[PDB]
Amino acid sequence: HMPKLMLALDVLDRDRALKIVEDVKDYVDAIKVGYPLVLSTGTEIIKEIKKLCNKEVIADFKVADIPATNEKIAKITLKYADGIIVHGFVGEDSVKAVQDVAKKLNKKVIMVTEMSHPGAVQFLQPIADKLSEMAKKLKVDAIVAPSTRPERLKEIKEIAELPVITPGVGAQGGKIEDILNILDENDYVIVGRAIYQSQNPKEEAKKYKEMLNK
Amino acid sequence: HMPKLMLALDVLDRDRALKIVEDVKDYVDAIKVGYPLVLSTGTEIIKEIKKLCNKEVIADFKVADIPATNEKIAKITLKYADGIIVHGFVGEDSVKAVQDVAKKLNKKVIMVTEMSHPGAVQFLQPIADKLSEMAKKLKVDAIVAPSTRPERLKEIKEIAELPVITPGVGAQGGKIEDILNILDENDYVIVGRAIYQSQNPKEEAKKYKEMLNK
Numbered sequence: 001h002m003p004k005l006m007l008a009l010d011v012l013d014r015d016r017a018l019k020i021v022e023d024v025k026d027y028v029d030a031i032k033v034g035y036p037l038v039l040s041t042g043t044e045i046i047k048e049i050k051k052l053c054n055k056e057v058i059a060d061f062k063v064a065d066i067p068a069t070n071e072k073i074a075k076i077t078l079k080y081a082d083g084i085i086v087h088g089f090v091g092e093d094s095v096k097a098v099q100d101v102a103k104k105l106n107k108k109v110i111m112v113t114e115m116s117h118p119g120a121v122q123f124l125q126p127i128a129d130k131l132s133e134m135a136k137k138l139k140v141d142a143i144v145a146p147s148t149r150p151e152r153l154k155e156i157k158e159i160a161e162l163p164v165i166t167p168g169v170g171a172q173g174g175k176i177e178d179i180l181n182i183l184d185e186n187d188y189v190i191v192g193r194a195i196y197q198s199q200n201p202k203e204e205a206k207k208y209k210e211m212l213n214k
Numbered sequence: 215h216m217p218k219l220m221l222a223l224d225v226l227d228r229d230r231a232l233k234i235v236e237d238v239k240d241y242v243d244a245i246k247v248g249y250p251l252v253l254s255t256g257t258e259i260i261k262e263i264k265k266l267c268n269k270e271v272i273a274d275f276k277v278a279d280i281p282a283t284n285e286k287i288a289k290i291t292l293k294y295a296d297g298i299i300v301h302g303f304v305g306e307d308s309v310k311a312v313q314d315v316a317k318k319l320n321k322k323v324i325m326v327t328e329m330s331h332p333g334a335v336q337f338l339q340p341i342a343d344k345l346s347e348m349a350k351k352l353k354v355d356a357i358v359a360p361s362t363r364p365e366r367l368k369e370i371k372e373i374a375e376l377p378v379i380t381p382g383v384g385a386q387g388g389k390i391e392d393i394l395n396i397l398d399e400n401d402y403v404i405v406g407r408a409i410y411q412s413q414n415p416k417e418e419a420k421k422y423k424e425m426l427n428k
């Protein structure tokens with residue numbers, strides 16, 4: 001009944017990736033696999049990860065193209081993954097193209113709203129409330145909203161009325177204690193580098209999991 | 215001294231992809247390879263295509279993440295590809311992270327401005343002039359701007375003062391005659407489905423190449 005922990009597995013080597021998954025599996029609740037890993041290893045890594053930890057695996061592919069292309073990417077991705085992350089800024093039709101594929105396969109679609117890095121302020125932040133409204137309109141499964149700006153995370157979550165997965169804790173300077181009050185059992189805190197760059201990923205994953213006790 | 219032709223190779227099979235490339239190589243000036251093909255075949259298809267047609271190969275990966283992740287994606291992609299397409303909407307720092315990688319490797323970075331599909335009007339269009347100003351500021355190699363809206367294509371090109379690659383002709387309803395007067399020899403017209411879904415891609419590539427005679 002606490003917020004959950006999602007590992008952002010952005011390593012570049014299959015062996016290192018599988019090793020980290022094995023090490024952290026008792027403490028992580030889902031694995032987020034992105035293009036840094038997938039372009040290095042191929043989509044086959046997704047099924048391998050899943051068989052190793054028996055947890056949900058989300059493909060963070062930041063899908064951001066026209067509907068026809070989004071549909072192709074979604075079909076390939078969701079053969080292997082349990083869900084897929086899509087950008088909202090490219091427009092409603094592009095999001096729906098991914099949703100249509102995910103609905104037929106019973107898979108999750110997660111939409112990016114405001115992002116966590118400084119550049120997000122330039123274009124994403126001024127329309128992030130409207131992205132949040134769109135996520136609510138489209139009934140996506142969850143949204144991505146930023147740990148680095150707790151006030152915005154709260155605001156975005158309350159507009160969307162959807163579960164969040166939230167990145168920014170650790171390497172990007174976000175701190176668990178500053179967002180813990182905002183999150184519930186249906187949310188995930190995303191942690192990448194703070195876990196995968198450590199000499200003892202098991203211990204760090206355990207530390208982060210226990211930090212989510214609220 | 216005419217606008218050039220860039221094939222959008224969004225097929226899902228390696229055999230079909232290589233066959234199309236072989237058939238159209240005398241008429242196309244560059245090949246754009248995206249995630250539909252790469253997630254299906256792996257990044258290795260990029261070197262294969264390059265050896266097959268001896269043309270520039272651009273990875274249309276719509277790079278749209280935080281700087282650290284963008285950097286990882288760029289490094290992997292540009293081992294193989296001659297250039298990479300990045301979104302501007304994620305912010306200046308994210309674009310620069312890709313540029314920094316490409317500068318070291320002497321590769322091209324192409325930034326998306328306004329997109330060609332209806333959904334682009336929702337969030338991209340209202341800030342596309344600012345994206346164009348940012349592309350100029352950042353001195354990227356080219357921008358993507360839409361064939362489907364000739365007046366916007368003209369406006370965007372004149373703000374950026376950069377070469378464009380422009381999609382939308384054919385499947386999306388754009389017509390060469392409507393943009394030809396806007397383009398010069400440093401620009402590329404992107405054509406995908408109208409060429410790759412035809413029973414005779416060679417003939418269609420020829421037709422499209424001849425249509426660029428201006």
Ligand SMILES: O=c1cc(O)n([C@@H]2O[C@H](COP(=O)(O)O)[C@@H](O)[C@H]2O)c(=O)[nH]1
Pocket residue numbers: 008009010034060114115116117144145146167168169170171172190191192193194279280283
């Ligand atoms: O706004 C966002 C959206 C993301 O998906 N991410 C992703 O979340 C992860 C964060 O990892 P890290 O803890 O190493 O900063 C990365 O995979 C990154 O691409 C992010 O950092 N900010």
Ligand SMILES: O=c1cc(O)n([C@@H]2O[C@H](COP(=O)(O)O)[C@@H](O)[C@H]2O)c(=O)[nH]1
Pocket residue numbers: 065066069222223224248274328329330331358359360381382383384385386404405406407408
């Ligand atoms: O605004 C844009 C930007 C793109 O990269 N594209 C890409 O250009 C290509 C267009 O192909 P087609 O001619 O089959 O519509 C696709 O690969 C698509 O993802 C686009 O259509 N519109």
